Amino acid sequence: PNSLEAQIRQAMKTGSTLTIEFDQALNQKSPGTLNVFLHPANGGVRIDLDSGNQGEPAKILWLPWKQGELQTLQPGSISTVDMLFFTYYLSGCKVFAGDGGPVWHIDAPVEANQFWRRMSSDEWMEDWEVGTDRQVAYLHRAGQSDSLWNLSAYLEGAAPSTYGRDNLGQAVVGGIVTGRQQMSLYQYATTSSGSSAWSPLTYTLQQRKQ
Ligand SMILES: [Br-]
């Protein structure tokens, strides 16, 4: 087979099944570029800081998870075509990504009005004028209470993407860098039924309402 990094990038693009296991220790690393090790795992790849166990070094873009908080990947971090991006597992969490803008990983219990308030101090958000459009990818868990994710007061456009059902399930989000400050996003979900194949996570047109 190819390098584990290439295997992931091909699984994403081809819409194949290839799971990702993350070491929790990665959440102690700040957002931005990160040197990790990739290893074979049952049905997929493990990403950690273990230099042994047939580990293959890779430089990725990384976005940690933090309890009760948002974490942000700034687009200034993004350059190298075909570099992979990952965030930690979504456990009821939300991911909001602006095309050419930041990516936010928001923990499950943070209310939508609160996380939008926090997001909106970012320079990319301040530059997004009411009545104008951006391309935004937004992913939440299906069946979660609407107060934890509904941004309809703020954005008009396509509905969010969802993962899971009945407020159960997890997701993995990653990406492939396509250029300066540019990435294409991919996702899969894990439920009682098993893990889905990768598919695109689509940026949709959104107009800012207020
Ligand atoms: Br929840």
Coordinates of C-alpha atoms and ligand atoms in Angstrom, one line a residue:
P1 CA 0.0 0.0 0.0
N2 CA 1.1 3.6 0.0
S3 CA 2.0 5.8 2.9
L4 CA -0.6 6.1 5.6
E5 CA -1.0 9.8 4.7
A6 CA -1.7 9.0 1.1
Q7 CA -4.1 6.3 2.1
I8 CA -6.1 8.8 4.1
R9 CA -6.1 11.4 1.3
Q10 CA -7.3 8.7 -1.2
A11 CA -10.0 7.4 1.2
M12 CA -11.3 10.9 1.5
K13 CA -11.4 11.6 -2.2
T14 CA -12.7 8.2 -3.2
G15 CA -15.4 8.0 -0.6
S16 CA -14.0 4.9 1.0
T17 CA -14.2 3.6 4.5
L18 CA -11.0 4.3 6.5
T19 CA -11.4 5.2 10.2
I20 CA -9.2 7.5 12.2
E21 CA -8.3 6.9 15.8
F22 CA -6.9 9.9 17.7
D23 CA -4.8 9.9 20.9
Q24 CA -6.4 12.1 23.5
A25 CA -3.0 13.5 24.1
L26 CA -3.3 15.5 20.8
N27 CA -5.8 17.8 22.6
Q28 CA -2.8 19.2 24.6
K29 CA -1.4 20.5 21.2
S30 CA -2.4 24.0 20.1
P31 CA -4.3 24.6 16.8
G32 CA -2.1 24.9 13.8
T33 CA 0.6 22.8 12.1
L34 CA 1.6 19.7 14.1
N35 CA 4.0 16.8 13.6
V36 CA 2.3 13.5 14.4
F37 CA 2.8 9.8 13.7
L38 CA 0.5 7.7 11.7
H39 CA 0.1 3.9 12.3
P40 CA -2.0 1.1 10.9
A41 CA -5.1 0.4 12.9
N42 CA -8.0 -2.1 12.4
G43 CA -10.0 -0.6 9.6
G44 CA -8.0 2.6 9.4
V45 CA -5.2 4.7 10.9
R46 CA -4.2 5.9 14.3
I47 CA -2.9 9.4 14.8
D48 CA -0.7 10.0 17.9
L49 CA 2.7 11.2 19.2
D50 CA 4.1 7.6 19.3
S51 CA 7.3 7.4 17.2
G52 CA 7.3 3.5 17.4
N53 CA 4.8 0.9 16.3
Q54 CA 5.5 1.2 12.6
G55 CA 4.9 4.9 12.9
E56 CA 5.1 7.2 9.9
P57 CA 5.8 10.9 10.6
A58 CA 3.4 13.4 9.0
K59 CA 2.9 17.2 9.3
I60 CA -0.8 18.0 9.5
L61 CA -3.0 20.9 10.4
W62 CA -4.6 20.2 13.7
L63 CA -7.6 21.6 15.6
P64 CA -8.0 20.3 19.2
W65 CA -11.2 19.9 21.2
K66 CA -11.6 21.5 24.6
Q67 CA -14.4 20.9 27.0
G68 CA -17.0 23.7 27.4
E69 CA -15.2 25.8 24.8
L70 CA -14.5 26.6 21.2
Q71 CA -11.1 26.1 19.6
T72 CA -10.1 27.8 16.3
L73 CA -7.8 27.0 13.4
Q74 CA -6.7 30.2 11.7
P75 CA -6.4 30.2 7.9
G76 CA -3.0 31.9 8.1
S77 CA -1.8 28.4 9.1
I78 CA -2.7 26.8 5.8
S79 CA -0.3 26.6 2.8
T80 CA 1.0 23.3 1.6
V81 CA -1.1 21.6 -1.1
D82 CA -2.2 18.1 -0.1
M83 CA -1.4 18.6 3.6
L84 CA -4.1 16.9 5.7
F85 CA -6.2 18.6 8.3
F86 CA -7.9 16.9 11.2
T87 CA -9.9 18.0 14.2
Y88 CA -10.5 15.7 17.2
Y89 CA -13.7 13.6 17.3
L90 CA -17.0 15.3 17.4
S91 CA -18.9 14.0 20.5
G92 CA -22.1 16.0 20.0
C93 CA -19.7 18.9 19.1
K94 CA -20.3 21.3 16.2
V95 CA -17.8 22.3 13.5
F96 CA -18.2 25.6 11.7
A97 CA -15.8 26.4 8.8
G98 CA -15.6 29.5 6.6
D99 CA -14.1 29.0 3.1
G100 CA -10.9 31.0 3.3
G101 CA -11.7 31.7 6.9
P102 CA -11.2 29.9 10.3
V103 CA -12.4 26.5 11.4
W104 CA -14.1 26.3 14.8
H105 CA -14.6 23.2 16.9
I106 CA -17.3 23.9 19.5
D107 CA -18.0 21.5 22.3
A108 CA -21.5 20.0 22.5
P109 CA -23.0 21.9 25.5
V110 CA -22.1 25.4 24.3
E111 CA -25.3 27.1 23.2
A112 CA -25.5 28.5 19.6
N113 CA -26.1 32.1 20.8
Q114 CA -23.0 31.8 22.9
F115 CA -20.7 30.2 20.4
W116 CA -21.8 32.6 17.7
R117 CA -21.1 35.5 20.0
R118 CA -17.6 34.1 20.6
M119 CA -17.0 33.4 16.9
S120 CA -18.1 36.9 15.9
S121 CA -15.1 38.6 17.5
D122 CA -12.8 37.0 14.9
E123 CA -11.4 39.3 12.2
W124 CA -13.0 37.1 9.4
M125 CA -16.4 37.4 11.1
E126 CA -15.9 41.2 11.6
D127 CA -15.1 41.5 7.9
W128 CA -18.4 39.6 7.0
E129 CA -20.9 42.4 6.6
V130 CA -24.6 42.0 7.1
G131 CA -26.4 41.3 3.9
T132 CA -23.4 39.7 2.2
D133 CA -22.4 36.1 1.6
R134 CA -19.8 33.6 2.6
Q135 CA -19.3 29.9 1.9
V136 CA -19.7 28.1 5.2
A137 CA -19.6 24.4 6.1
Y138 CA -21.5 23.7 9.3
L139 CA -22.0 20.3 10.9
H140 CA -24.0 19.3 14.0
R141 CA -25.5 16.1 15.5
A142 CA -29.0 15.3 14.3
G143 CA -31.6 15.3 17.0
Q144 CA -29.6 17.5 19.3
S145 CA -31.6 20.3 21.1
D146 CA -31.8 23.2 18.7
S147 CA -30.5 25.7 21.2
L148 CA -27.1 24.0 20.9
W149 CA -26.8 24.5 17.2
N150 CA -29.4 26.6 15.4
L151 CA -27.9 29.6 13.7
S152 CA -31.0 30.6 11.7
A153 CA -31.2 34.0 13.6
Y154 CA -27.7 34.8 12.1
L155 CA -27.5 33.0 8.7
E156 CA -29.8 32.4 5.8
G157 CA -29.0 29.7 3.4
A158 CA -28.7 25.9 3.2
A159 CA -29.5 23.9 6.3
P160 CA -26.5 22.6 8.3
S161 CA -25.0 19.2 7.6
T162 CA -25.7 16.6 10.2
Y163 CA -24.2 13.4 11.7
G164 CA -25.8 10.7 13.7
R165 CA -29.5 10.4 14.6
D166 CA -31.6 10.9 17.8
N167 CA -28.7 12.8 19.4
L168 CA -26.5 9.7 19.2
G169 CA -23.3 9.3 17.3
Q170 CA -20.0 10.8 16.5
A171 CA -18.2 12.3 13.6
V172 CA -14.7 12.8 12.2
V173 CA -13.9 15.9 10.2
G174 CA -10.7 16.4 8.2
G175 CA -9.6 18.1 5.1
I176 CA -7.1 18.4 2.3
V177 CA -5.3 21.7 1.6
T178 CA -5.9 22.9 -1.9
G179 CA -4.0 26.2 -1.8
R180 CA -3.1 29.3 0.2
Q181 CA -5.7 29.6 3.0
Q182 CA -7.8 27.0 1.2
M183 CA -9.0 23.5 2.0
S184 CA -11.6 21.0 1.0
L185 CA -13.4 19.3 3.9
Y186 CA -14.4 15.7 4.4
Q187 CA -16.3 13.8 7.0
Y188 CA -17.5 10.4 8.2
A189 CA -19.8 9.3 11.1
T190 CA -19.8 6.5 13.6
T191 CA -23.0 5.1 15.1
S192 CA -24.2 1.8 16.6
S193 CA -24.3 0.5 13.0
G194 CA -20.6 1.2 12.5
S195 CA -18.6 3.8 10.6
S196 CA -19.6 5.4 7.3
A197 CA -17.5 6.0 4.3
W198 CA -15.9 9.4 3.9
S199 CA -17.8 12.1 2.0
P200 CA -17.4 15.8 1.3
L201 CA -18.4 18.3 4.0
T202 CA -19.9 21.0 1.8
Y203 CA -19.4 24.8 2.2
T204 CA -22.8 26.3 1.3
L205 CA -23.7 29.9 0.5
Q206 CA -24.8 31.8 3.6
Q207 CA -26.0 35.4 3.9
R208 CA -25.3 37.1 7.2
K209 CA -28.6 38.3 8.7
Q210 CA -27.4 40.4 11.6
Ligands
BR1 BR -25.6 16.8 23.4

